[PDB]
Amino acid sequence: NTVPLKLIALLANGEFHSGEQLGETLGMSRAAINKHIQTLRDWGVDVFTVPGKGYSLPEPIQLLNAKQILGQLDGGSVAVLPVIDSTNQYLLDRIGELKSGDACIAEYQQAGRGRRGRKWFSPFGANLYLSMFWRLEQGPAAAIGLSLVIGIVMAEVLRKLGADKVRVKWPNDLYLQDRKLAGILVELTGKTGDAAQIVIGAGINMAMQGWITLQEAGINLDRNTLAAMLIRELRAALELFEQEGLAPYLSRWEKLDNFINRPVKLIIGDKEIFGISRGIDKQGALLLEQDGIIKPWMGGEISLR
């Protein structure tokens, strides 16, 4: 899967390359070069061909840079995949060579997946596809605020890099102009009386419904920075979490919650609760008030009313 990665690696500028310059550099035929080209077209890559001359990218992409990323971070263990099934799987598939905070990003995911068996959609270098491994001592017991924590953090990072208006949805997504901007998939394995092993996936809509991307709201952030900022502050919070639970969030959450003090709809399976958000409880529980009556709920999905 090399060559592709090389090609792509040079077309990245958004300029013209004749199959001529490419093949010599690559030390291969124009002929060979056209096959790789296909592979590319396949990764969501939009290659513009001009028959016997050369190739071009409609748009210039910015690839991930291990080193750039590695660079910062402070003490970091990151895997930078270019191509893979899915960032979550990769780690799930390897829970025991892993340690807390281990991460990885890919340029493109062949089987990107969401919550409730939904396809994620992960074209080469258009966005941010990331996952982080974390282990919890008490075990399966937690997670809940773990995820609140994650969304919270992400909102902060975004907010600080530009995108000043990003908010959070209880319990798993980022919002902007009320459309879904990022998606979060947390997956746990546990035992009774034994650590919970967590794999956390975050998907962020960068490049250009009900869904929204950073580019449409006109925000144009650096990928590598983004990346690196994320991992660093999550490592930081997952600890803090590890050490305290929600205690430290709560107020954080309230100021970023997109639906607080608004009409919504909560459902576990097919069961519909209707009313007003009063936030979250000390247990990452949703607060729902129905007729001057506030109550806690740890499940279902939240849409608006």
Ligand X SMILES: O=C(O)CCCC[C@@H]1SC[C@@H]2NC(=O)N[C@@H]21
The residues assigned a catalytic role are 115, 180, 305
As measured in angstroms, the least distance from the Cβ of 178 to ligand X is: 16
Interface pick for ligand X out of 88, 147, 205, 258 (rule CB under 6 A): 88
Residue count at the site for ligand X (CB under 6 A)?
20
Is 262 assigned to a binding site?
no
Annotated binding residue 87: yes
Neighbouring C-beta atoms of residue 141, cutoff 10 Å = 11
Shorter beta-carbon distance to ligand X: residue 22 or 221? 221
Residues paired with residue 294 on neighbouring β-strands, in sequence order: 289
Contacting residue, 129, 134, 241, 253, with ligand X by CB under 6 A: 129
Residue 115 annotated as binding site: yes
H-assigned helices in the chain: 2-11, 19-25, 30-41, 66-71, 87-92, 144-161, 223-244, 251-254
Backbone region of residue 32 per phi and psi (left: phi > 0; alpha: psi in -120 to 50; beta: other values): alpha
User: What one-character DSSP code corresponds to residue 289?
Assistant: E
Q: Residue 288: what residue type?
A: L
> Does residue number 123 form part of the binding site for ligand X (CB under 6 A)?
no
Among 8, 17, 87, 198, binds ligand X (CB under 6 A): 87
Which among 42-50, 59-67, 105-113, 241-249 is the span making contact with ligand X, rule CB under 6 A? 105-113
Task: Work out how close the CB of 266 gets to ligand X at its nearest, in angstroms, rounded to a whole number.
Answer: 17
Torsion-angle region of 179 (φ positive above 0: left; ψ -120 to 50: alpha; else: beta): beta
Q: Is 114 in the site for ligand X (CB under 6 A)?
A: yes
Asked if 154 is part of the footprint of ligand X (rule: CB under 6 A), the reply reads no
**202's tokens:** 């975050």
- 180 has binding-site annotation: yes
CB of 16 vs ligand X, minimal distance in Å: 32
Assess 277 for contact with ligand X (CB under 6 A).
Answer: no
CA distance 250 to 21: 57
Tokens of 3: 């060559």
Q: How far is the CB of 84 from ligand X (least distance, A)?
A: 9
- Mark the segment that binds ligand X (CB under 6 A) among 53-61, 124-132, 133-141, 255-263: 124-132
Report the site for ligand X in 166-205 (rule: CB under 6 A): 173, 183-185, 201-203
Q: Is 86 an interacting residue with respect to ligand X (CB under 6 A)?
A: yes
Q: Which residues contact 124 (CB under 8 A, 6 or more apart)?
A: 8, 40, 43, 44, 45, 61, 107, 108
What are residue 132's DSSP bridge partners? 103, 200
Cα–Cα distance between 33 and 27 in angstroms, integer? 10
Q: How far is the CB of 272 from ligand X (least distance, A)?
A: 20
The residue ranges that bind ligand X (CB under 6 A) are 86-88, 109, 112-115, 118, 120, 129-131, 173, 183-185, 201-203
Binding site membership: which residues?
86-88, 109, 113-115, 180
